[PDB]
């Protein structure tokens, strides 16, 4: 429960206060915010709770204290690789993503834990998702911010999907759990999902491969568009 995981990282409130201080320094924000109070609402969101008993309503004071107007049309959905998703948003800083949003710039590459009894950070151990339980607060936060960002996405989506695994599009990811259900086809029309031939591909007949053919099988019964440009 508590154990069998890597715990909280070192210098947690100093890196939270520094990170978004760089955000109100570099970006002239549409409200200049109290970076200290952001961390107090973050502390009240999860602190001294049971790791595998965390729901989504604990995090909405943070999400209503971080209300951005993420520009629609210029959006990007990522999955699988993080380094090439980082290089694709470094070539694509016009098209804003979850590693360019305020809340992703707050809690990017961070994990947190906390023992249930008293006010302390559990620095040593961590609730893993498969091995302990999938209600840990890091996956709660990433589910909430990918739901809000994929709901307010609009016009043209450009998903990067690697093929280094045998499962190119796995069903049980956050992409195929909340993102492709709330892609909202009244404002999105065309979906240029960009399959990657990097790594080790499962099969030939690329773009006739079976999991991206299952996504080419249109989930929306309005039958909004699907497309699949490749990267060799």
């Amino acid at each position, epitope marked *: 429960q508590q154990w069998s995981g890597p715990g909280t990282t070192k210098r947690f409130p100093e890196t939270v206060l520094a990170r978004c201080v760089k955000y109100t*320094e*570099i*970006h*002239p*924000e*549409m*409200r*200049h915010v109290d970076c200290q109070s952001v961390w107090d609402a973050f502390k009240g969101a999860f602190i001294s709770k049971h790791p595998c008993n965390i729901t989504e309503e604990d995090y909405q004071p943070l999400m*209503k204290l971080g*209300t951005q*107007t993420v520009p629609c049309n210029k959006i990007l959905l990522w999955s699988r690789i993080k380094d090439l998703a980082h290089q694709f948003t470094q070539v694509q800083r016009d098209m804003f993503t979850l590693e360019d949003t305020l809340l992703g710039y707050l809690a990017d590459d961070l994990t947190w834990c906390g023992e249930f009894n008293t006010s302390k950070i559990n620095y040593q151990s961590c609730p893993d998702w498969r091995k302990d339980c999938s209600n840990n607060p890091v996956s709660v936060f990433w589910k909430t911010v990918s739901r809000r960002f994929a709901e307010a996405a609009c016009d043209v989506v450009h998903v990067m999907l690697n093929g280094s695994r045998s499962k190119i599009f796995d069903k049980n990811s956050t992409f195929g759990s909340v993102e492709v259900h709330n892609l909202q086809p009244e404002k999105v029309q065309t979906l240029e999902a960009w399959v990657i031939h990097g790594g080790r591909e499962d099969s030939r007949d690329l773009c006739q491969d079976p999991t991206i053919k299952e996504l080419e099988s249109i989930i929306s019964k309005r039958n909004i568009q699907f497309s699949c440009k490749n990267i060799y």
Partner: antibody
Amino acid sequence: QVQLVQSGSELKKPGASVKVSCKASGYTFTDYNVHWIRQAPGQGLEWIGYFYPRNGATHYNQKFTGRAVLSADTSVSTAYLQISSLKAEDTAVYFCARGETPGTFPYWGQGTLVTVSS
Amino acid sequence: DIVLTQSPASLAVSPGQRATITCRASESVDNFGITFMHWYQQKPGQPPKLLIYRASNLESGVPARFSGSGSRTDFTLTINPVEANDTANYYCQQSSKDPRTFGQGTKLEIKR
């Protein structure tokens, strides 16, 4: 097309409270900010402070703190400004301004001359 | 704040010739890869139509006569083919720190 339209000229007494009102047309109101910018006549320009109409989140300049109380209405799509307890040196022209970010101003209102005398 | 003062106080240029309306910051406005220096052209009886913002970007709808170069100290605004309808004030404006004070202006007039 995107446009802005603000209220007309006002002759104020010393001690009175100005209430400038704009009106945003051509675009959805919840996306961008509504700044305010001064012009004393024959002089330079001076920033006041900007409103955020998504959740009511204001931010003023350090000189105009307390005097300036920004507000809006999300249904009627009108921005606001209020400076109270006026005096004779504060006769100027104010403009409502939308920026693409904070730190730019492409779109403007037409101008409002307020004059303080008795 | 940051206090900025416009270094040519006036100009009188006949058309077909060039002009230079510069200003000088007290410190660096250029931090972390952004510089904030935004010039603004203001004719009388007209609120300022936006010019070169973040020291490079000519806005769409503005003519391509204008060429503005911003830095950490020196901010020139040169107009090479000046015309008869350019009789306006040319403010500068920074936005690096949270005080967002402007310049003070420069009365450009046309020599005839």
